[PDB]
Amino acid sequence: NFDPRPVETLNVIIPEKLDSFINKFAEYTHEKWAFDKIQNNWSYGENVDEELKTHPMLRPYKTFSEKDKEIYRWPIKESLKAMIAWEWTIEKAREGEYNPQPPDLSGVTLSRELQAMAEQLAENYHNTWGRKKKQELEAKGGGTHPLLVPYDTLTAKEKARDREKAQELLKFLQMNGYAVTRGLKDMELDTSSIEKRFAFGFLQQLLRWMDISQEFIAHLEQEIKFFAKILLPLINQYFTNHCLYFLSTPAKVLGHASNKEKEMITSLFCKLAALVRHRVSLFGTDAPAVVNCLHILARSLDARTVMKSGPEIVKAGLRSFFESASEDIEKMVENLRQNLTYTTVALLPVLTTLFQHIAQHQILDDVQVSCYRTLCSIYSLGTTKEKLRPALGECLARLAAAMPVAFLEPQYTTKSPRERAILGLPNSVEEMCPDIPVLDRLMADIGGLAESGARYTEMPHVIEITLPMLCSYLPRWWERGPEAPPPALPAGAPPPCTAVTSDHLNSLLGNILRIIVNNLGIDEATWMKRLAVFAQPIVSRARPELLHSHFIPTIGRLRKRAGKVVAEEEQLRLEAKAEAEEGELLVRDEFSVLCRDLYALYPLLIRYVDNNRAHWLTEPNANAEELFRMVGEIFIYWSKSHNFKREEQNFVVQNEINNMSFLTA
Amino acid sequence: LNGEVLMSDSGSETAFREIEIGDGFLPVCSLGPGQVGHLNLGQDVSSL
């Protein structure tokens, strides 16, 4: 593969100046060798050996033969000739024809460019020496090749010999003004912050192949499938494993990632959105792969700061994509009650995108008007009719939690001048949203609806959109309330826009308790489970004064129901029969339904059990006795039925859940 | 730490995997430089 160019070495004629220079070099080498011999006291002898340390060499070289002079005539001249023949970088130095101390050179830092040039020179010397060695082995016939050692992992002998040669060259090139350096690079950008890691080049090249693939999207009227199958799992596992180094800016690492990483991530999101659109049925074979890649990107959507240094660029594309999504949502909500498959069975990853990422403290007018438009579109003729509701609830909770100001009542602070000076929606809340009332009216309506205590039925268009929204809304602004103690002076200094107090939390707890106790277990009821899952910290600011009314009726009803079902089961079964077996399996199904409802309802009551246990440790009351009686009754009822345990184990197996929500943490 | 068992990564009452007795056990406390600690071994109800 590698074919070097053999430059002539013996065909040239040595000039008189070169002959004088090589004669002077040979004389200097002989003088230095004589000085070393007289310093180390190498005496004469009648024979050459090692045990007597005898070597007669202090004689003039003019009386020697050509064979002995040839081994020392060109000790370093071959390398210089190769350098002057191969590399055409001949410098122009000259035209043709009392005890000072050495300075300190290791104190100052070493330049990256100089080190790179020295490493390149060493690599060139090693490669060329290996080339002479291979040529000599071929000339001699061949045989073993013990020199096949990588340069990065060279042996100690070579790693000492090359350093000795380099330091000898440095100490011999000090005079006569000799310095060779061929390079032009900067270490402040190529190996400092951005181009030092290989991630930037990887992102640029994957962008290049993505654009190349996009260049012929309208070609169906081979290569793309193989390219996708190669890249998508690889980039997915790269995001899955290597994700901590791109968490934030390198100044706050541990997480080294500049705005280039965020720009590449946004470009990848735009490219995958484009591939999703246009043709959908053509790329239906890789649809699960696309969904998995979107999920991975959403779970790794760091979304670093871009507008601080880059003038948006991708912000317009994101706005256009969000507008297209809102228009598509309006189209479905209009025509329901090419992108049909994506808008039906693939909008859940979109509504789930960055849902859990932007949830802490860690937010714009455009996002606010977009979520307002989507809410108005959904609420317009959204009844009757898709298995698209948990994703909508998650998107609503994410949009509510990530709000610069209050999005429920006008009591904006950071509004834009275009809302009043340009043609747009008014800055008010009640006028802009015709179906979202003020916070007080909304909570009054919710309390009135909860006070009714109606049955479950189905009604999958009011409770599952209202209860999760308020349940994710109130705790978010509970710490920013005008009455709650703020952790900073600036938070209390600005006029607050929200108004949440303990009465709202008490009403929330009462409504949740009423909706749990109203849901009788006769069939599958996933609405309560979804509500419990979507709002875990609903007891973070509980008010422990109405604990008797919360728990004593509920535990009494639970014990009564358990007693009556176990008594009915015993009465119907007694012996073993086909009718007895049918009754037993019906009771097992009822037990499974009750156990599923209990699995939904545990986290809140368990957190409250921890809380009031702590309160009783601080100050007890008259509740531990009846609590213990209820616990004993329910556990002896559970223990007195092996079929109940078998059904519970079967339901746990068929649930395929890790039950990691109990530990919280 | 404060009225609550310290939770581990696994999520259960993690121990040191059934330490063999050998000779016995003894309470040992440590202290770094520039640190102030209070060792309350417990001699009365008011101590706890």
XYZ file of C-alpha atoms in Angstrom, chain A residues 101-472:
372
model
C 26.169 28.837 33.779
C 23.723 27.074 31.442
C 20.255 28.638 31.271
C 17.099 27.016 32.603
C 14.773 25.750 29.864
C 12.431 23.360 31.711
C 11.000 26.059 33.988
C 8.835 27.573 31.254
C 5.850 25.661 29.899
C 6.081 23.732 26.631
C 4.109 25.020 23.655
C 1.562 22.620 22.180
C 2.654 23.408 18.612
C 6.323 22.736 19.402
C 5.447 19.443 21.108
C 3.285 18.423 18.139
C 6.091 19.250 15.693
C 8.587 17.279 17.792
C 6.211 14.303 17.920
C 5.710 14.495 14.146
C 9.481 14.575 13.597
C 9.948 11.587 15.918
C 7.194 9.661 14.120
C 8.762 10.445 10.734
C 12.173 9.293 11.981
C 10.711 6.072 13.403
C 8.798 5.323 10.193
C 11.847 5.967 8.010
C 14.093 3.845 10.256
C 11.545 1.044 10.024
C 11.656 1.474 6.255
C 15.439 0.992 6.191
C 15.053 -2.017 8.493
C 12.449 -3.601 6.207
C 14.648 -2.917 3.169
C 17.663 -4.480 4.906
C 15.624 -7.537 5.908
C 14.392 -7.938 2.324
C 17.946 -7.578 0.991
C 19.327 -10.139 3.456
C 16.532 -12.608 2.658
C 13.963 -11.974 5.373
C 13.082 -14.021 8.437
C 11.733 -12.898 11.797
C 10.299 -9.389 12.216
C 10.691 -8.356 15.877
C 10.347 -4.650 14.993
C 6.561 -4.886 14.431
C 5.829 -2.766 17.503
C 3.394 0.191 17.489
C 4.901 3.633 18.004
C 2.522 4.466 20.868
C 3.640 1.306 22.737
C 7.331 1.123 21.856
C 9.809 -0.843 23.945
C 11.914 0.754 26.672
C 15.124 0.373 24.651
C 13.682 2.280 21.688
C 11.995 4.809 23.994
C 15.442 5.539 25.448
C 17.398 5.454 22.172
C 15.091 7.910 20.393
C 15.209 10.313 23.351
C 19.011 10.067 23.423
C 19.147 10.801 19.687
C 16.774 13.752 20.118
C 18.786 15.273 22.971
C 22.035 14.728 21.048
C 20.532 16.521 18.042
C 19.321 19.337 20.307
C 22.744 19.760 21.930
C 24.528 19.591 18.555
C 22.168 22.001 16.749
C 22.543 24.770 19.352
C 25.203 26.542 17.280
C 25.272 27.647 13.608
C 21.604 28.714 13.841
C 19.733 25.531 12.906
C 15.975 25.308 13.478
C 13.357 23.478 11.394
C 9.637 23.820 12.126
C 6.851 23.302 9.571
C 3.388 23.764 11.047
C 0.490 26.173 11.409
C -2.121 25.408 14.068
C -3.668 26.852 17.221
C -4.308 24.922 20.434
C -6.826 27.442 21.816
C -9.652 26.018 19.680
C -8.470 22.766 18.078
C -7.508 21.095 21.370
C -8.916 23.297 24.158
C -12.708 23.332 24.435
C -14.569 22.284 21.258
C -12.397 20.289 18.841
C -10.390 18.561 21.597
C -13.063 15.874 21.929
C -14.121 13.761 18.959
C -17.812 14.461 19.643
C -17.909 17.639 17.534
C -16.548 15.923 14.428
C -18.939 13.015 14.963
C -21.888 15.416 15.184
C -20.786 17.304 12.064
C -20.310 14.132 10.016
C -23.635 12.615 11.107
C -25.271 15.920 10.158
C -23.534 15.619 6.779
C -24.870 12.118 6.095
C -28.305 13.154 7.381
C -28.375 16.020 4.870
C -27.134 13.670 2.133
C -29.979 11.268 2.948
C -32.454 14.169 3.005
C -31.239 15.268 -0.445
C -33.354 12.536 -2.116
C -36.404 12.199 0.139
C -38.741 12.358 -2.885
C -37.125 9.474 -4.754
C -39.599 6.596 -4.300
C -42.112 8.216 -6.704
C -30.817 -0.273 -0.498
C -28.775 2.564 1.022
C -31.107 4.618 3.237
C -32.330 1.544 5.138
C -28.786 0.283 5.748
C -27.638 3.764 6.797
C -30.514 4.077 9.277
C -29.942 0.565 10.649
C -26.255 1.369 11.166
C -26.678 4.822 12.700
C -29.866 4.781 14.805
C -28.910 2.021 17.320
C -25.369 3.411 17.525
C -26.450 6.992 18.230
C -29.150 5.700 20.601
C -26.625 3.742 22.663
C -24.234 6.711 22.537
C -26.944 8.909 24.057
C -27.887 6.181 26.554
C -24.346 5.590 27.834
C -22.526 8.881 27.157
C -24.941 11.454 28.577
C -23.288 12.943 31.692
C -20.541 14.796 29.795
C -23.165 16.934 28.000
C -25.222 17.913 31.059
C -24.172 21.575 31.216
C -21.382 23.995 30.338
C -17.749 22.925 30.917
C -17.386 25.718 33.497
C -19.767 23.772 35.783
C -18.761 20.247 34.772
C -19.417 17.403 37.240
C -20.343 17.782 31.995
C -18.288 19.568 29.331
C -20.486 20.818 26.482
C -20.581 24.219 24.789
C -23.436 25.670 22.723
C -22.312 23.473 19.809
C -23.685 20.368 21.540
C -27.053 22.057 22.119
C -27.137 23.251 18.503
C -26.377 19.722 17.282
C -29.096 18.277 19.534
C -31.656 20.786 18.242
C -30.594 20.080 14.650
C -31.035 16.349 15.292
C -34.509 17.010 16.704
C -35.443 19.079 13.644
C -34.051 16.427 11.282
C -35.962 13.606 12.969
C -39.126 15.727 12.908
C -38.600 16.282 9.173
C -38.045 12.556 8.568
C -41.239 11.838 10.517
C -43.189 14.251 8.304
C -43.468 14.144 4.486
C -43.371 10.357 4.001
C -44.664 8.182 6.856
C -45.853 4.919 5.283
C -42.603 4.651 3.305
C -40.612 4.669 6.569
C -43.068 2.422 8.418
C -40.564 -0.430 8.675
C -38.306 1.700 10.909
C -41.166 3.358 12.821
C -40.382 1.586 16.151
C -36.735 2.593 15.692
C -37.777 6.211 15.088
C -40.023 6.130 18.171
C -37.205 4.693 20.299
C -34.761 7.315 19.001
C -37.264 10.072 19.804
C -37.718 8.651 23.314
C -33.945 8.503 23.838
C -33.470 12.076 22.601
C -36.320 13.277 24.831
C -34.741 11.555 27.837
C -31.406 13.171 26.870
C -32.786 16.583 25.815
C -30.370 18.642 27.898
C -31.360 21.851 26.040
C -28.361 23.992 26.953
C -28.231 27.759 26.491
C -28.141 28.778 22.819
C -29.473 32.349 22.612
C -26.689 33.632 24.889
C -24.122 33.216 22.089
C -25.942 32.026 18.962
C -28.664 34.162 17.381
C -31.477 31.602 17.779
C -31.188 29.993 14.305
C -33.071 26.853 15.375
C -35.662 28.801 17.392
C -37.559 29.642 14.195
C -37.529 25.974 13.193
C -38.809 24.938 16.621
C -41.587 27.538 16.412
C -42.547 26.293 12.940
C -42.579 22.675 14.143
C -44.758 23.583 17.134
C -47.132 25.535 14.881
C -47.369 22.540 12.537
C -48.089 20.238 15.488
C -50.797 22.597 16.766
C -52.360 22.782 13.295
C -52.329 18.980 13.036
C -53.946 18.685 16.479
C -56.630 21.159 15.390
C -57.157 19.129 12.210
C -57.721 15.913 14.173
C -59.994 17.536 16.750
C -62.015 19.040 13.885
C -62.342 15.992 11.613
C -62.656 13.403 14.415
C -65.392 14.880 16.624
C -50.235 11.365 5.024
C -49.401 11.810 8.717
C -52.443 9.893 9.987
C -50.357 7.082 11.504
C -47.984 9.527 13.216
C -50.790 11.732 14.515
C -52.788 8.730 15.794
C -50.371 6.154 17.228
C -47.157 8.200 17.441
C -48.079 11.535 19.077
C -47.537 10.059 22.558
C -43.705 10.368 22.311
C -44.199 13.959 21.140
C -46.438 14.825 24.092
C -43.987 12.957 26.358
C -40.942 14.800 24.951
C -38.938 16.639 27.657
C -41.858 16.116 30.048
C -39.738 15.128 33.063
C -36.636 17.113 32.051
C -37.817 20.707 32.595
C -39.613 20.221 35.913
C -37.297 21.702 38.574
C -36.177 25.319 38.975
C -33.292 24.720 36.517
C -40.566 29.716 30.041
C -41.466 32.015 27.150
C -44.441 33.820 25.645
C -44.365 31.669 22.498
C -44.643 28.437 24.497
C -47.460 29.998 26.533
C -49.495 30.971 23.471
C -48.773 27.572 21.898
C -50.064 25.671 24.933
C -53.066 28.007 25.146
C -53.851 27.291 21.486
C -53.496 23.532 21.994
C -55.733 23.644 25.081
C -58.389 25.645 23.219
C -58.178 23.229 20.279
C -58.530 20.171 22.532
C -61.431 21.658 24.505
C -63.241 22.497 21.237
C -65.457 19.486 20.405
C -63.154 17.166 22.340
C -65.974 15.079 23.825
C -67.682 11.925 22.436
C -65.150 10.221 20.067
C -58.520 7.185 20.520
C -56.409 6.034 23.493
C -54.770 9.487 23.667
C -55.247 10.921 27.162
C -52.305 10.160 29.526
C -49.960 11.812 27.018
C -52.244 14.857 26.842
C -52.344 15.035 30.638
C -48.558 14.778 30.877
C -48.146 17.525 28.271
C -50.645 19.718 30.138
C -48.819 19.182 33.440
C -45.451 19.945 31.823
C -46.794 23.110 30.178
C -48.357 24.249 33.460
C -45.247 23.564 35.558
C -42.940 25.370 33.097
C -44.659 28.768 33.144
C -42.911 32.136 33.657
C -46.047 33.574 35.312
C -49.433 32.369 36.540
C -51.336 30.727 33.675
C -54.667 30.387 35.517
C -55.540 33.797 37.004
C -54.591 37.369 36.023
C -54.091 38.536 39.631
C -48.721 39.541 32.748
C -45.759 40.488 34.937
C -43.287 39.533 32.180
C -45.567 40.141 29.200
C -44.262 41.118 25.765
C -44.891 44.491 24.080
C -46.162 42.669 20.973
C -49.210 41.463 22.928
C -50.462 45.071 23.115
C -48.693 46.932 20.280
C -48.698 44.217 17.605
C -51.648 42.239 16.227
C -51.963 39.472 18.800
C -53.877 38.115 21.752
C -54.504 40.482 24.688
C -52.312 40.323 27.776
C -55.336 39.440 29.928
C -56.112 35.843 30.893
C -59.916 35.663 30.990
C -60.345 37.402 27.625
C -57.570 35.459 25.874
C -58.881 32.076 27.047
C -62.662 31.768 26.503
C -62.866 28.384 28.272
C -60.341 28.806 31.121
C -61.901 30.872 33.950
C -60.199 32.548 36.907
C -58.527 30.374 39.541
C -61.182 31.057 42.194
C -64.055 30.164 39.857
C -62.208 27.049 38.675
C -61.565 25.784 42.207
C -65.152 26.577 43.232
C -66.452 24.592 40.247
C -64.088 21.705 41.040
C -65.248 21.661 44.662
C -68.886 21.741 43.592
C -68.330 18.855 41.180
C -66.523 16.841 43.865
C -69.289 17.563 46.395
C -71.800 15.733 44.171
C -70.138 12.365 44.785
C -71.487 10.733 41.629
C -70.542 7.303 40.311
C -67.549 6.530 38.100
C -69.368 5.549 34.865
C -66.922 6.560 32.148
C -66.988 10.380 31.593
C -63.354 10.394 30.310
C -63.250 14.092 29.421
C -63.578 16.099 32.662
C -61.944 14.423 35.674
C -58.802 13.168 33.919
C -58.115 16.627 32.442
C -59.090 18.688 35.488
C -57.755 16.804 38.528
C -54.188 16.179 37.199
C -53.936 19.807 36.049
C -54.767 21.296 39.455
C -52.807 18.543 41.232
C -49.676 19.535 39.292
